[PDB]
Design a binder for this molecule. Structure first.
Ligand SMILES: *[C@@H]1O[C@H](CO)[C@@H](O)[C@H](O)[C@H]1NC(C)=O
Length: 329
């Protein structure tokens, strides 16, 4: 059940610790892994080769770096690498695959092997990567990504790891939840929600998009005066991102009540989100702007800053996302 997430210095923090100015730079790739601060561990093959990977609801693909990456792409060779020759359960596919990480592309080739997560082993097709772009993977500690999205938003319709876990019928519920710690680490839970890391009762919102973790938000109120999204804004609850995102035009109106107007005062107004008629509020605590074109545009993103306060259950059977007040012990 329990997969313990570990704390990580993001590529942003790695760059900001050095001291630097502003610099340059199929399904929709939502998250930039520049700001990601969390990873979990998974085992591939027989015997298991361990990999540090991001648990990302934004994507539906599982990829790790291969031993077969070229000398021309140096970002791949740094991380832990998958060798097919050390696995008895390896079964070759050979088909090309290409995820568009940002402007640049993450290229490789497909392959099948036994993938172990949270004690459960499943036969999974994954893309062993041969070309990672320079930004932002060279500085990043995490090896690859584990997609928690739907089969439709995967590449080549490859069934995700959670879908294979549902096929076995091992879990009590067909769900997974996420908890990020207030401070060292996190937690992904499979087949339920952990009562230690929540308080009160869950309340659920139905999924609006056909096959994604997207829900329609009905109000973004600053303090006690409403600004945006009364008619309806689409919102993705991403696990692999830390920041909260919004449309570029919408972000300006919220910032009013390169440039960020942050000064040391704790009496700034609380900001809340209306999800299924219930107000989900954040005291202080940052934002960003992502303008995606339609379809899947314009859209917001609720990252780890939201999920830190609210423990989030991702329900696949009922197609819904539940929220509840978080806590530690
Ligand atoms: C690779 O696996 C996929 C299943 O996701 C399948 O559709 C495809 O035919 C396989 N390709 C080869 C060359 O075996």
């Amino acid at each position: 059940e329990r997969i313990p997430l570990k704390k990580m210095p993001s590529v942003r923090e790695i760059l900001e610790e050095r001291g630097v100015d502003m610099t340059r730079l199929s399904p929709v790739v939502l998250t930039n892994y520049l700001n990601t601060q969390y990873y979990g561990e998974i085992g591939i093959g027989t015997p298991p080769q361990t990999f540090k990977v991001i648990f990302d609801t934004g994507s539906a693909n599982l990829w790790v770096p291969s031993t077969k990456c070229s000398r021309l792409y140096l970002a791949c060779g740094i991380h832990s690498l998958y060798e097919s020759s050390d696995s008895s359960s390896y079964m070759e596919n050979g088909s090309d695959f290409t995820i568009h990480y940002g402007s640049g592309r993450v290229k490789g080739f497909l392959s099948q092997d036994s993938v172990t997560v949270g004690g459960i082993t499943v036969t999974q097709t994954f893309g062993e990567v041969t070309e990672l772009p320079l930004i932002p993977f060279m500085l990043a500690k995490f090896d690859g990504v584990l997609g928690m999205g739907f089969p439709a938003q995967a590449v080549g319709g490859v069934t995700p790891v959670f879908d294979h876990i549902l096929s076995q019928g091992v879990l009590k519920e067909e769900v997974f939840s996420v908890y990020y710690n207030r401070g060292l680490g996190g937690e992904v839970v499979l087949g339920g929600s952990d009562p230690q890391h929540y308080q009160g009762n869950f309340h659920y919102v139905s999924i609006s998009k056909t096959d994604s973790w997207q829900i329609t938000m009905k109000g973004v109120s600053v303090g006690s005066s409403t600004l945006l999204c009364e008619e309806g804004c689409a919102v993705v609850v991403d696990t692999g991102s830390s920041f909260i995102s919004a449309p570029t035009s919408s972000l300006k109106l919220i910032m009013q009540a390169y440039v960020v107007n942050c000064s040391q005062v704790p009496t700034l107004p609380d900001i809340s989100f209306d999800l299924g008629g219930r107000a989900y509020t954040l005291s202080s605590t940052a934002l960003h702007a992502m303008d995606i074109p339609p379809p899947t545009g314009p859209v917001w993103v609720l990252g780890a800053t939201f999920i830190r306060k609210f423990y989030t259950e991702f329900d696949r059977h009922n197609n819904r996302i539940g929220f509840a007040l978080a806590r530690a012990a």
